[PDB]
């Protein structure tokens, strides 16, 4: 107390638990002081961030250097989360997922480094997880069966019949099939492979499905013994929990067992190229749009200097942002309205994941004959910028955007910190140096004001003068995945043929022991744990005050320490709008702040918003009632941000938007609609679970009906249909129809969060705004298939439950978390082989079953039937109800930002009263209430069902007449 104030007392040279204070430096603009220490005997490098935020976070880092496309480090992660010396219990990870009040909980394997992050708010639990991951990373029991489990292994379709064929399975196999399901990821990964073909950067670290089966247990264990030495370990901490305790635990627990070695993990530099090359590659089709010729993507990439010289890398990042961000940026001006493509390529702008940064730029969806056209345009635009450079207002707009990024306060801030620092600290950079952001801006302004032509000459050096240029053209192949299946079966037959009958018996026996492992309920009593008694009883109350102004519009002010940041939100109902125009409303949400306003054209309004604001976005929301299925609230939320000083101007922009937006630029309108059509078309895989949830619930709830109209596959389908229309003017006749019903104050409410010192001025500005605006069921079961060209599956089952305020809601919440933790997690992930699939209950009281990338389909349906059967059986313990209470508390008590707390009152009208009552009811949750509610709603014949599927073809589903094919 304070975190920085105590951290300042650390003196250089202090010997503490085998470490020595090496540097302590305060970063006041981030309101913390960073301290880095080193292990004296082994030399282990450590970084701490001490900042007065309760949500403490820990992660560790290893420099991971694969030399092949087998994916050894990524699978190595997936194994070392499943068992270690000191906690040899089976799968420590997903059990501790049911043990925590953690805020974020997973791990990534990046291209050249591996990171194990977690974040939580309870100190003793933090110590527990500290011990668990240090032991899991450093002393993992590396059983060959786990090697089989998370990596690659051959088993019969039924592990009990040694007569059915052996096939490749393992979670990593399906996960890499999915990772290369996306064409955008194909393009990215191939790009890294091509640009730096000299070393480990030339391989696919995540793992090529065509190369994984080549890994043997001996190779994996050799890799782990080679790379996981403490001398290759990076420790990074952020939060407020006392540091010396961290030192005590780590020193006396892990580091004592090893001695100094030197990792032979230095990454050599890419040799400079002298001449460009050109390459043409194939990828997968589109979902599921038109013009099989107008699907071509092209890019040019450029080598950048080493990123350890931080300032110039920052400089070049800003230059990239100048080059590509916003519809007033040059390459936008040359490319977008050229009618040549549909939007910017993947990986636009500065991309610094690897050692050596690269610039990228390009388009999607062209005709391949224009690749030379595109690159010629690139060269000409580059030269034009060389000769004239950029307008200074765009400089200031970028600087204002970076400043806003500097002060914005996240709910997962530590993860942001670690992801932004990971690469540099990995490659022997000085991690404090990226933290000196204010310093960066200072020298940035200095360098701009000293040279008018600095920016143009930098473009010269690093685009026109680098012979290390590479141009990539990328076209889809309709039989790409057919080719993949061919080569997969080919490798499969060669690998099965080389197997001896004794080898085949060992394989079958080990499959037998594997599903035995997956079947036996085992203990984790050696794991530490919490109890329901360990949760604080009450929440700190959230302060509100409702001030009716002009003359009945409620406005909320919440004094907060946001560091000079103003947060505005506004929501208008839709009750008067004629229902036929609802499906086009989402576009109205998406573009209304993007069409131009009054005396400002699209370029000028964009320049002003990006110069003064932080982002001005609209996305429609449907708010259900808490106590009635046939009552719900539908409307649009406008959201924004500014620093305190620039508020009046922003709100002025809001006013001129509300009264006179420019609805006549239909050309740039067509461009925007076709481009957002492109992102909705190419984003489909990543949120398939949500799309299925939405589709399955369409015929179940009026709130479900309007959400489906607003945010589902129906919406993207309508959008694509629109984006192919040649004549838009009838649609342009629709916009004023909406405007005349939307932006007024007839049925309006607004919300404001601001710093305490600021409210009086905000009140004047907002009343100016408000004076400146006008003042004139039967559920029915459906089964649906979207024929998707995908190697994986997405299933949705929804069952109509009852809303929030019924006391059984707590029961159903614990039931859902229970089912996920103890039936569906086991079956669906480890037995089934899908990476993700589970069940959740939304605030709307709709109980959902979801699947994310499952190789299996009908076994899923059988698994859900058996899951509800098992729930109704009661065949589960009271300790599990304890732990599911614990996890539900881990979700509902998620840290809430200065920016969001509490939006849910302003949205749903739920006070602290109802939620606190729900929290006491969660304390009081019993076994008999759970069994009663499970008998009341989840039993067969009691409720209405809804079913949906997105994925490849299934003849069995196709021959079912009670299924509808879509």
Curated annotation (Swiss-Prot):
It comes from the Eukaryota. Changing residue 89 to S: No loss of metalloendopeptidase activity under oxidizing conditions. Keywords: Acetylation, Disease variant, Disulfide bond, Hydrolase, Metal-binding, Metalloprotease, Mitochondrion, Neurodegeneration, Protease, Transit peptide, Zinc. Zn(2+) binds at residues 74, 78, 175. Monomer and homodimer; homodimerization is induced by binding of the substrate. A disulfide bond locks the enzyme in the closed conformation preventing substrate entry into the catalytic chamber. It is an enzyme of class 3 (hydrolase). The gene is PITRM1. Its EC number is 3.4.24.-. Optimum pH is 7.7. The modification N6-acetyllysine is found at residues 729, 740, 813. This is Presequence protease, mitochondrial. Binds 1 zinc ion per subunit. GO terms for biological process: protein processing; protein targeting to mitochondrion; proteolysis. Disulfide bonds join 89-526. Changing residue 153 to Q: In SCAR30; decreased function in degradation of amyloid-beta protein 40; decreased metalloendopeptidase activity towards different substrates including an amyloid-beta peptide derivative; decreased protein levels in patient tissues; no effect on mitochondrial localization. Changing residue 77 to Q: Loss of metalloendopeptidase activity. Loss of activity towards an amyloid-beta peptide derivative. One of its GO terms (molecular function) is metallopeptidase activity. InterPro entries: Metalloenz_LuxS/M16 (IPR011249), Pept_M16_N (IPR011765), Peptidase_M16_C (IPR007863), Peptidase_M16C_assoc (IPR013578), PreP_C (IPR055130). The active site is at residues 77, 150. Its main location: mitochondrion. GO terms for cellular component: mitochondrial matrix; mitochondrion. Metalloendopeptidase of the mitochondrial matrix that functions in peptide cleavage and degradation rather than in protein processing. Has an ATP-independent activity. Specifically cleaves peptides in the range of 5 to 65 residues. Shows a preference for cleavage after small polar residues and before basic residues, but without any positional preference. Degrades the transit peptides of mitochondrial proteins after their cleavage. Also degrades other unstructured peptides. It comes from Homo sapiens.
């Amino acid at each position: 107390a304070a975190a920085c104030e105590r951290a300042l007392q650390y003196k250089l040279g202090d010997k503490i638990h085998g470490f020595t204070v090496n540097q302590v430096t305060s970063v006041p603009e981030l309101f913390l002081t960073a301290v880095k220490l080193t292990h004296d005997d082994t030399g282990a490098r450590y970084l701490h961030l001490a900042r007065e935020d309760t949500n403490n976070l820990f992660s560790v880092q290893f420099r991971t250097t694969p030399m092949d496309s087998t994916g050894v480090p990524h699978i190595l992660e997936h194994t070392v989360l499943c068992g270690s010396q000191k906690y040899p219990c089976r799968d420590p990870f997903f059990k501790m997922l049911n043990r925590s009040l953690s805020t974020f909980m997973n791990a990534f394997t990046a291209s050249d480094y591996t990171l194990y992050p977690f974040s939580t708010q309870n100190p003793k639990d933090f110590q527990n997880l500290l011990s668990v991951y240090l032991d899991a990373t450093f002393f993992p029991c590396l059983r060959e069966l786990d090697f089989w489990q998370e990596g690659w292994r051959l088993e019969h379709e039924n592990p009990s019949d040694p007569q059915t064929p052996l096939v490749f399975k393992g979670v990593v196999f399906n996960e890499m099939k999915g990772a290369f399901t996306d064409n955008e990821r194909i393009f990215s990964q191939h790009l890294q492979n091509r640009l730096l073909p000299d070393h480990t950067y030339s391989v696919v670290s995540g793992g090529d499905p065509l190369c994984i089966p080549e890994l043997t247990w001996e190779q994996l264990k050799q890799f782990h013994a080679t790379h996981y030495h403490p001398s290759n370990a990076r420790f990074f901490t952020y939060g407020n929990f006392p540091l010396e305790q961290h030192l005590k635990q780590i020193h006396e627990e892990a580091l004592s067992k090893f001695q100094k070695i030197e990792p032979s993990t230095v990454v050599p530099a890419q040799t400079p190229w002298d001449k460009p090359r050109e390459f043409q590659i194939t990828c997968g089709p589109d979902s599921f749009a038109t013009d099989p010729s107008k699907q071509t993507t092209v890019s040019v990439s450029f080598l950048l200097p080493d990123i350890t010289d931080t300032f110039e890398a920052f400089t070049l990042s800003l230059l990239s942002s100048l080059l590509t961000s916003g519809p007033n940026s040059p390459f936008y001006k040359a490319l977008i309205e050229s009618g040549l493509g549909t939007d910017f390529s993947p990986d636009v702008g500065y991309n610094g994941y690897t050692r050596e940064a690269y610039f990228s730029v390009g388009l999607q969806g062209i005709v391949e004959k224009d690749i030379e056209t595109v690159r010629s345009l690139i060269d000409r635009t580059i030269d034009e910028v060389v000769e004239k450079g950029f307008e200074d207002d765009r400089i200031e707009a970028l600087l204002h955007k970076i400043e806003i990024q500097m002060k914005h306060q996240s709910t997962s801030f530590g993860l942001m910190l670690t992801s932004y620092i990971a690469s540099c600290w990995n490659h022997d950079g000085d991690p404090v140096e990226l933290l000196k952001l204010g310093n960066q801006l200072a020298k940035f302004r200095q360098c701009l004001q000293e040279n008018p032509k600095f920016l143009q000459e930098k473009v010269k050096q690093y685009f026109k003068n680098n012979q290390h240029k590479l141009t990539l053209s990328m076209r889809p192949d309709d039989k790409y995945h057919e080719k993949q299946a061919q080569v997969e079966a080919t490798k499969l037959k060669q690998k099965v043929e080389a197997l001896s009958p004794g080898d085949r018996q060992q394989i079958y026996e080990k499959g037998l022991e594997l599903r035995s492992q997956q079947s036996k309920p085992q203990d984790a009593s050696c794991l530490p744990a919490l109890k329901v008694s360990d949760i604080e009883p009450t929440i700190p109350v959230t302060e509100l005050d409702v001030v009716l102004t002009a003359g009945d519009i409620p406005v909320q002010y919440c004094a907060q320490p946001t560091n000079g940041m103003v947060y505005f939100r506004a929501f208008s109902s839709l009750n008067t709008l004629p229902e036929e125009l609802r499906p086009y409303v989402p576009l109205f949400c998406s573009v209304l702040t993007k069409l131009g306003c009054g005396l400002l054209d699209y370029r000028e309004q964009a320049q002003q918003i990006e110069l003064k604001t932080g982002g001005m976005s609209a996305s429609p929301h449907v708010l259900p009632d808490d106590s009635h299925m046939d009552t719900y609230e539908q409307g649009v939320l406008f959201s924004s941000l500014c620093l305190d000083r620039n508020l009046p101007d922003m709100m002025q922009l809001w006013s001129e938007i509300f009264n006179n937006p420019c609805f006549e630029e239909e050309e740039h309108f067509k461009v925007l609609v076709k481009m957002t059509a492109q992102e909705l078309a190419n984003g489909i895989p990543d949120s398939g679970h949500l799309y299925a949830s939405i589709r399955a619930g369409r015929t179940l709830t009026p709130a479900g009906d309007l959400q489906e109209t607003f945010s589902g596959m129906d919406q993207v389908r309508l959008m694509k249909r629109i984006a192919e229309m040649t004549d838009i003017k009838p649609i342009l006749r629709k916009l004023p129809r909406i405007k005349k019903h939307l932006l007024n104050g007839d049925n309006m409410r607004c919300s404001v969060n601001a710093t305490p010192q600021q409210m009086p001025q905000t009140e004047k500005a907002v009343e100016d705004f408000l004076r400146s605006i006008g003042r004139s069921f039967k559920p029915w079961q459906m089964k649906t298939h979207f024929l998707m060209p995908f190697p994986v599956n997405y299933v949705g089952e929804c069952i109509r439950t009852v809303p929030y305020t019924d006391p059984d809601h707590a029961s159903l919440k614990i039931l859902a978390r229970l089912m996920t933790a103890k039936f569906l997690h086991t079956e669906i992930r480890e037995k089934g082989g899908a990476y993700g699939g589970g069940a959740k209950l939304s605030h709307n009281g709709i109980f959902t079953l979801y699947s994310y990338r499952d190789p299996n389909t009908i076994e899923t349906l059988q698994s859900f039937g058996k899951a509800v059967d098992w729930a109704k059986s009661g065949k589960f313990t009271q300790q599990d109800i304890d732990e599911a209470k614990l996890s539900v508390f881990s979700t509902v008590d998620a840290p809430v930002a200065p920016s969001d707390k509490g939006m849910d009152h302003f949205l749903y009208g739920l006070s602290d009263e109802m939620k606190q009552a729900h929290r006491e009811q969660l304390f009081a949750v019993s076994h008999d209430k759970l069994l009663a509610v499970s008998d009341r709603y989840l039993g067969t014949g009691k409720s209405t069902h809804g079913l949906a599927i997105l994925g490849p073809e299934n003849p069995k589903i196709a021959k079912d007449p009670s299924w509808i094919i879509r």
